[PDB]
Curated annotation (Swiss-Prot), chain A:
Name of the protein described by the UniProt record: Protein TPR1
Effect of residue 73 to A: Loss of interaction with EAR motif-containing full-length proteins
Residues of the full protein shown: 2 to 201 of 1129
Gene that this sequence comes from: TPR1
Consequence of substituting residue 103 to A: Loss of interaction with EAR motif-containing full-length proteins
Domain CTLH: start-end pairs: 33-91
UniProtKB/Swiss-Prot annotation, chain D:
Boundaries of the shown chain within the full protein: 2 to 180 of 1129
Protein name per UniProt: Protein TPR1
Coiled coil regions in record: none
Top-level taxon of origin: Eukaryota
Subunit structure: Tetramer. Interacts with D53. Interacts with WOX1. Interacts with MOF1.
Domain LisH: 3-35
Effect in UniProt of substituting residue 103 to A: Loss of interaction with EAR motif-containing full-length proteins
Gene (UniProt): TPR1
Known role: Probable downstream regulator of strigolactones signaling.
Length: 182, 9, 183, 179, 186
């Protein structure tokens, strides 16, 4: 219902005021009603890729449309690059097969080119990546793209803005029920 | 001003 | 306030009814108001020791009292044992020093005796652990010991039972509010 | 001196007769005078890859010529595919970079082509590798190749036959000295 | 024969003079007639415990007597301690169970004490191991002990000194055979 939906938001407001950080974002994710930009942003910077994909998965799947396909590919690209940078070529190959391979069907050559970064001494030998700066510069610069990709995604375009309402509305409405457990 | 094909850069 | 407190339960009830399983337990945890027993068991059987320990953290720390101390100990011991059984001694060592070493001060001889299980071809050579049957049965027999330890713990004894009330109590109160006090 | 050279063979024969298995071959490798084809055959079947290349290095470097160039290539290629078979993708890569990458300058596309075998469920899905059976076969059908390659290689061609001589020739010449 | 045995020494000399360093040592090992002390010290300092234990295995097994038993024990202990130093506890335990677990039957309680060194932040917290200085110093200081154990061991005591003889003795006898007559056939 539309009733149920707007109750979610009230509850959300409450949790945030009770400093229940985790519970807030599990709700956002499971309800799919509000995508917390500033939360997403923070998680990207931290390199929490398992959580990042998990939170996204509450709002869209990898193959839903063209926007979210690139959003995912982009994350699983950076994940693979950092793996490469810390020279953990084991985790890279794992990433390559489990995470990046689903995008090969669409782009067979691109996948081969991503696979060949494994043999380079430093993947910045590849000219298209010679500008990749470090972990921190690269995540933020990727984050910028992601904000755009999300805000242009139709599945998100109605969910990014938290409807503004009075401080502690849920406590006040509960108070109206007490004026009117049990 | 946006461009959503898949590549390295 | 007790107001805010009870408000959480209404939410907890709303969440459960909307099949927001994860958010339910995240609130159970962070609020530390209700301890879902059926969830805990489900996780102990699933061997989600990380989640299990993370869920207990919302109620009690490892050194708060004697009951909680044995609770954590047992879980880490079991984690330790499952590592030995898949012959991942590397992981077993990591657990022995990272998690279990905190209990060495209280019982030096037990830590040593637990330490020495690494050097065994099968830790069932120790007669006290010769009754480890398999991963399922051992989690099960331990789970039953854990239920006892929790239900006795003073920090938990008042947070085990969910206060009974009307289905969709929050949706009722809110539907009241759409009717109320604007008229 | 050629004196010193022929003295080695005496010693070799001496060493073989005394059942000093490791020493004989260290002597072979370090002196580079005789290439023990049966030894080699044994090691390549047994999959002792480090040891096979160690032994070889006594007789030829990777870039010495066309033939020895392919010989090291074949060995390293198998060493790689074997790593893929046992699903050890770590070692598969480690070999791909440390061992195989030296040939990529010579054949870029072939190297890319070998790289991409990592992302397959089973590398026999490459139609040129669709006849790879099991380790045991693949080792032996490659051993034949090596044998032809070595026997054609100039740096080996005059070192593949052990000069036949009377048994314990070294103990007899020692006897001539005590007399 | 003692003949064959003494021919080994000539070959050894020759091999050494031909700068065939690796072959020399394989012979010493497999024949078990001469134990190269300078070479042993060299590989112990370098820490090649796989090569060190392989070299000894040409002259003795781990349970041949008291001296050799303790020699292998000291080696494997140091291998275990170094693993604790680079904080590779994975390998430490591997060593403890594959290499050091053979000495438990003989020393039941020492094994428990050694085992408990894994749980320590730094094994020098044990008083008996509080003197372990760096890798270089402890290798060196243990080498000293090994030398004493090797020189005292009955299986080595007669195999420690290379019999001195005229240079290229083997090249000389070959020439006497050529004077007496390729070398392959007369």
């Amino acid at each position: 219902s539309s009733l149920s939906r707007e109750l979610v938001f009230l509850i959300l407001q409450f949790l945030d005021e009770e400093k229940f950080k985790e519970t807030v974002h599990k709700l956002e994710q499971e309800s799919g009603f509000f995508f917390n930009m500033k939360y997403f942003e923070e998680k990207v910077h931290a390199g929490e890729w398992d959580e990042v994909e998990k939170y996204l998965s509450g709002f869209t799947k990898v193959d839903d449309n063209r926007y979210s396909m690139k959003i995912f590919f982009e994350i699983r690209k950076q994940k693979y690059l950092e793996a490469l940078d810390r020279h953990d070529r084991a985790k890279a190959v794992d990433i390559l097969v489990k995470d990046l391979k689903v995008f090969s069907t669409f782009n067979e050559e691109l996948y081969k080119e991503i696979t060949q970064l494994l043999t380079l001494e430093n993947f910045r030998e590849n000219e298209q990546l010679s500008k990749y700066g470090d972990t921190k510069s690269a995540r933020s610069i990727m984050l910028i793209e992601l904000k755009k990709l999300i805000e242009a995604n139709p599945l998100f375009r109605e969910k990014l803005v938290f409807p503004t309402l009075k401080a502690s509305r849920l406590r006040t409405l509960i108070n109206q029920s007490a004026n009117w457990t049990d | 001003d946006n461009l959503i094909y898949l590549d390295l850069n």
